[PDB]
């Protein structure tokens, strides 16, 4: 799961340029647009009927900030992702009943959002590093399911 020192530096360098609130809203919104069954957890968020209704949904945006905020905090602990996300894993299983496949889908959408935002700066080696990260985070969030 782990990254080379070169990959850790690449992840940190790119992330330093990321507006986490904005990228978070964008990633969660795109998840709900591209994989619309993921809307099943968000009936209380109101209008999700069109791509614009989803992307501009204030509750979608607010939740995206929260989700990617936790993701961002986790980048400081790449050596212990399972520990880092243990309590959120338990919560998503026991209270929220969220299929962990959702974490994998969000990871892939996030990689697409980073590519879209950064263009050529999101090089193939930078992507490879981030693929390790989102797989690690999704596996960590899945780890305490039972």
């Amino acid at each position: 799961v782990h990254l080379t020192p070169e990959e850790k530096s690449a992840v940190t360098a790119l992330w330093g340029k990321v507006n986490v609130d904005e990228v978070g809203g964008e990633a969660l919104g795109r998840l709900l647009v591209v994989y619309p069954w993921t809307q099943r957890f968000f009936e209380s968020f109101g209008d999700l009927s069109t791509p614009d209704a989803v992307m501009g949904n204030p509750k979608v945006k607010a939740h995206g900030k929260k989700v990617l905020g936790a993701f961002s905090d986790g980048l400081a602990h790449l050596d212990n992702l399972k520990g880092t996300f243990a309590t959120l894993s338990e919560l998503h299983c026991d209270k929220l009943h969220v299929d962990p496949e959702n974490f994998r889908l969000l990871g892939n959408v996030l990689v697409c959002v980073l590519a879209h935002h950064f263009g050529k700066e999101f090089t193939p080696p930078v992507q490879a590093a981030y693929q390790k990260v989102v797989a690690g985070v999704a596996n960590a969030l899945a780890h305490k399911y039972h």
Binding site: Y35, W37, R40, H97, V98, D99, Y145
Partner: protein, 141 residues
């Protein structure tokens, strides 16, 4: 695509199952919940206790749907249309879980068909369950 040989194998195997189908449907669900606990995220509203009448009732529904699909193996998209609508739009079960239930149905059949579960029939049943899963996920987006 299900070959004519596949269809012959599936019909013969499910024919042998007969009235045990409902029981096997419940067993497959129980096997799935135990073996692949993430699938329980779709049933938090269920009673999942041992011998759960709710799970048994649901296994019967799953089995009946499969029985109908076998009976209409030449025209499954039409036979499973409403069920496909339900999983795609109401339930919104992530498509990855259909392989998990399919595997558990296959394991259940293997455990109950010592003579019939030949390699060829194993193959046809796997293809059949994948075809059912394909139809049931065809309207998701």
């Amino acid at each position: 695509v299900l070959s004519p040989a596949d269809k012959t194998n599936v019909k013969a195997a499910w024919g042998k199952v007969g009235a045990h189908a409902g029981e096997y449907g419940a067993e497959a669900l129980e096997r799935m919940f135990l073996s692949f606990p993430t699938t329980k995220t779709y049933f938090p509203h269920f009673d999942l206790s041992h011998g759960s009448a709710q799970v048994k009732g649901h296994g019967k529904k799953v089995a009946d749907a499969l029985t109908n699909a076998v009976a209409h193996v030449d025209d499954m998209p039409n036979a499973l249309s409403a069920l496909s609508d339900l999983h795609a739009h109401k339930l919104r079960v992530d498509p990855v879980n259909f392989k998990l239930l399919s595997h558990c149905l296959l394991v259940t059949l293997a455990a109950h068909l010592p003579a019939e579960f030949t390699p060829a029939v194993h193959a046809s049943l796997d293809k059949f369950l994948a075809s059912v899963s394909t139809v049931l996920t065809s309207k998701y987006r």
